[PDB]
Design a protein that fits this description.
Chain A: Involved in the pre-mRNA splicing process. May play a role as regulator of AR transcriptional activity; may increase AR transcriptional activity. Chain A: Pfam families: BUD31. This is part of a larger assembly, with chains A and B. Chain A is mainly alpha-helical. Chain A has one domain. Helix content of chain A is 38%, strand content 0%. In chain A, α1 runs antiparallel to α2. The longest helix of chain A is centred in the middle third of the chain and has 20 residues. By secondary structure, chain B is low in regular secondary structure. Chain B is elongated, with a radius of gyration of 28 Å. The N and C termini of chain B lie far apart (75 Å). The chains are: A mainly alpha, B little secondary structure. The interface between A and B is small, with 4 and 4 residues.
């Protein structure tokens, strides 16, 4: 894939080069998957699932492990390795394992509330194996 | 108790039905009476005047 900047990315990008390439090749193979098998919105579920794992790799390298530099962190967010809004929602203590950024939108639901993805299982009902249609999982 | 949550429809769409041919109201009225003045004959020369 083209980096779309051509501006000589700094050190640490070669350390995260094959890891981000394997996640990018997984999303491109998921984007080339046909519409068979998925019912109506299940085909967009591996699109957010590969995007959720791509944002978790950069955030763990910056906040958890703190091994990547801040100059390589800003170059990764600008080139499109991880969304800045997804890292902003994970900075708050109220949401650290959110499914998708579409599930946190208050205006998305018809009843004007959150989804089942942003709800714990202990506070939910007993018999419920439901999954979020907009987000993708719990 | 039932919450009235208005569903936000798509603001780019053709209308869901044709022109409504249903009756909206009732063709009877409240026919209020006149009670203006007692109508009577004018005169015997009213046919000649």
């Amino acid at each position: 894939k083209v980096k779309r900047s051509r501006k000589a990315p700094p050190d640490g990008w070669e350390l995260i080069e094959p890891t981000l390439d394997e996640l990018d090749q997984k999303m491109r193979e998921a984007e080339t998957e046909p519409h068979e098998g998925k019912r109506k919105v299940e085909s967009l579920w591996p699109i957010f699932r590969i995007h959720h794992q791509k944002t978790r790799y950069i955030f763990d390298l910056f906040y958890k492990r703190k091994a990547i530099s801040r100059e390589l962190y800003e170059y990764c967010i600008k080139e499109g390795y991880a969304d800045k809004n997804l890292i902003a929602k994970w900075k708050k203590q109220g949401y650290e394992n959110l499914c998708c950024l579409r599930c946190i939108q208050t205006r998305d639901t018809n009843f004007g509330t959150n989804c089942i993805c942003r709800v714990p299982k202990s506070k939910l009902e007993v018999g419920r194996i439901i999954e979020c249609t907009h987000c993708g999982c719990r | 108790v039932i919450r009235m949550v208005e569903m936000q429809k798509d603001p780019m769409e053709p209308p869901r039905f044709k022109i409504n041919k249903k009756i909206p109201r009732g063709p009877p009225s409240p026919p209020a009476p006149v009670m203006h003045s007692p109508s009577r004959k004018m005169t015997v020369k009213e046919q000649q005047e």
